[PDB]
Amino acid sequence: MNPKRIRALKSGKQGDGPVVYWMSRDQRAEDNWALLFSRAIAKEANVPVVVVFCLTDEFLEAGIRQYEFMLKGLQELEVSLSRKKIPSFFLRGDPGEKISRFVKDYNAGTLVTDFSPLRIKNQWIEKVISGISIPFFEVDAHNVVPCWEASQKHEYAAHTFRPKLYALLPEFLEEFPELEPNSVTTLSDVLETGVKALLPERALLKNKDPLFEPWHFEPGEKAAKKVMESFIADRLDSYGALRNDPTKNMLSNLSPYLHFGQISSQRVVLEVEKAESNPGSKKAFLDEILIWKEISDNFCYYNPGYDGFESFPSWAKESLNAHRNDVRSHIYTLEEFEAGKTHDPLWNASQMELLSTGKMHGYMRMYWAKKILEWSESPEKALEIAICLNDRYELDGRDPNGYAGIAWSIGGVHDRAWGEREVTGKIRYMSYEGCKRKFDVKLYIEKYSALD
DNA sequence: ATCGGCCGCGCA
DNA sequence: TTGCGCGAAGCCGA
Numbered sequence: 144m145n146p147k148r149i150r151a152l153k154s155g156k157q158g159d160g161p162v163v164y165w166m167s168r169d170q171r172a173e174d175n176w177a178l179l180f181s182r183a184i185a186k187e188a189n190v191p192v193v194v195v196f197c198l199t200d201e202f203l204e205a206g207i208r209q210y211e212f213m214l215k216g217l218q219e220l221e222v223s224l225s226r227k228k229i230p231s232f233f234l235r236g237d238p239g240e241k242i243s244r245f246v247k248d249y250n251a252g253t254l255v256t257d258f259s260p261l262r263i264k265n266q267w268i269e270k271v272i273s274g275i276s277i278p279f280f281e282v283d284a285h286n287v288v289p290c291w292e293a294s295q296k297h298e299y300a301a302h303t304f305r306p307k308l309y310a311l312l313p314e315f316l317e318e319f320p321e322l323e324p325n326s327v328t329t330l331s332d333v334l335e336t337g338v339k340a341l342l343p344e345r346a347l348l349k350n351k352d353p354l355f356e357p358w359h360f361e362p363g364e365k366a367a368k369k370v371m372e373s374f375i376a377d378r379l380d381s382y383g384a385l386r387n388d389p390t391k392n393m394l395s396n397l398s399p400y401l402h403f404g405q406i407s408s409q410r411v412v413l414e415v416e417k418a419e420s421n422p423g424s425k426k427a428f429l430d431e432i433l434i435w436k437e438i439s440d441n442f443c444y445y446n447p448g449y450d451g452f453e454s455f456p457s458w459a460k461e462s463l464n465a466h467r468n469d470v471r472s473h474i475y476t477l478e479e480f481e482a483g484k485t486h487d488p489l490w491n492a493s494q495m496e497l498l499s500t501g502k503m504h505g506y507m508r509m510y511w512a513k514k515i516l517e518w519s520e521s522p523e524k525a526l527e528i529a530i531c532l533n534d535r536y537e538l539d540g541r542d543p544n545g546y547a548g549i550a551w552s553i554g555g556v557h558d559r560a561w562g563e564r565e566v567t568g569k570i571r572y573m574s575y576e577g578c579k580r581k582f583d584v585k586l587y588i589e590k591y592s593a594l595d
Numbered sequence: 596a597t598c599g600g601c602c603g604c605g606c607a
Numbered sequence: 608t609t610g611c612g613c614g615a616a617g618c619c620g621a
């Protein structure tokens with residue numbers, strides 16, 4: 144393994160016991176540098192490797208759509224791990240509290256977790272640290288260049304981070320060895336229970352049936368390898384030319400799998416790299432999954448206030464400030480956006496794309512989040528409604544890519560200042576009629592007319 | 596250091 | 608549509 148992928152969190156005396164992988168972000172058995180590290184420590188010490196996943200009450204902030212998708216990654220994940228003789232364990236509480244009992248109860252010798260830059264991970268890791276005595280390592284298994292190696296500061300834009308990332312790519316772009324089975328030796332209720340809890344929160348139509356359409360993405364590692372091979376085979380060619388057209392389904396549709404870590408961006412990079420197609424389609428796509436996926440981690444990692452106004456750049460702050468008294472063409476309430484009740488049929492279309500499938504089209508997500516800022520009473524409230532719907536309804540929500548994507552839209556983070564306007568100040572504008580030069584907007588509204 | 600280099604619109 | 612040149616606009620890093 145490339146050692147630079149490892150951070151030592153807590154130093155102590157290596158217990159005699161097993162290596163416990165605390166599985167958080169990267170819920171996969173293959174192409175996992177974290178579990179590949181745990182097994183190596185279990186191997187040298189001739190102790191086993193084991194997985195422990197912590198199911199927290201944060202699922203009740205989202206909905207059936209995400210929770211189902213995730214606890215079927217997990218059922219399949221466990222069949223896979225047992226097949227390698229690595230048993231997995233599923234605790235049901237506060238990680239800081241619960242993971243600390245596990246290591247102590249089970250005489251864990253060494254504890255490993257994967258890397259995530261979101262605030263709450265830090266709260267737990269710091270609680271685990273103060274309650275264990277065995278060593279404690281962290282591994283970046285979600286990025287190609289470990290987040291703290293690509294850059295040590297917040298990067299102002301993609302084109303300041305782009306040299307830094309490619310500087311280090313030949314070293315960190317590499318094949319994955321093979322997860323070696325152990326030598327040394329309930330998820331059904333958990334879902335049935337979680338679901339009954341979330342059942343009065345489903346989005347229904349006027350009729351009783353749910354809004355969500357569960358057949359657009361199958362969850363799992365197996366599914367995610369076919370979404371990836373499908374993209375490489377059918378859409379990667381057309382990607383640069385049609386990535387921006389909401390009527391063509393020419394995206395990878397990989398974001399829900401990456402979010403849960405059911406597939407590794409590094410594998411995807413490897414396979415796109417090796418694959419022949421339009422060299423511009425490969426360049427266009429590699430920038431999305433290398434430069435934009437990883438500066439988004441860079442973002443939350445250096446900006447603890449990443450989901451708030453205070454992390455916008457200074458120019459963006461001043462400008463939105465001076466336009467807090469400008470009169471707004473419309474003001475909608477959370478619940479009115481929520482049910483696509485604006486005058487803008489394009490907006491409502493895209494909101495209807497969000498509610499029924501769980502994945503709104505890449506381009507339409509920009510447009511969507513800017514009209515929230517233009518038609519709400521203040522930036523804080525627009526940031527609030529946009530996080531809220533993003534995380535409530537996007538399969539790929541509750542994710543750095545989310546906070547970094549909203550802050551681009553509403554705040555100009557990783558963007559630049561544009562022609563000053565009312566309400567939106569110097570923040571990049573996007574117009575209806577600009578969409579109309581770009582794609583048959585009429586076809587996209589026809590698609591989603593379930594506003595009942 | 597001193598400057599290059601990161602959507603909407605008019606038009607053919 | 609479809610590409611091009613332009614506009615308005617602040618800031619990083621050679």
Ligand SMILES: Cc1cc2c(cc1C)N(C[C@H](O)[C@H](O)[C@H](O)COP(=O)(O)OP(=O)(O)OC[C@H]1O[C@@H](n3cnc4c(N)ncnc43)[C@H](O)[C@@H]1O)c1[nH]c(=O)[nH]c(=O)c1N2
Pocket residue numbers: 386394395396397398399401402431432433435436437439503504505508509512533534537539540541542544545546547548549552
């Ligand atoms: C308003 C709004 C809200 C969000 C986001 C953007 C915007 C404008 N993003 C990011 C982005 O829109 C999203 O990653 C893409 O729709 C990914 O879909 P595909 O994988 O189908 O795209 P596509 O195949 O074109 O991109 C491939 C991969 O590159 C990365 N990438 C592409 N666009 C990116 C972007 N704008 N920012 C960062 N990485 C990007 C993603 O990992 C994506 O899976 C996000 N993403 C997410 O996973 N969860 C979220 O909740 C949000 N929230």
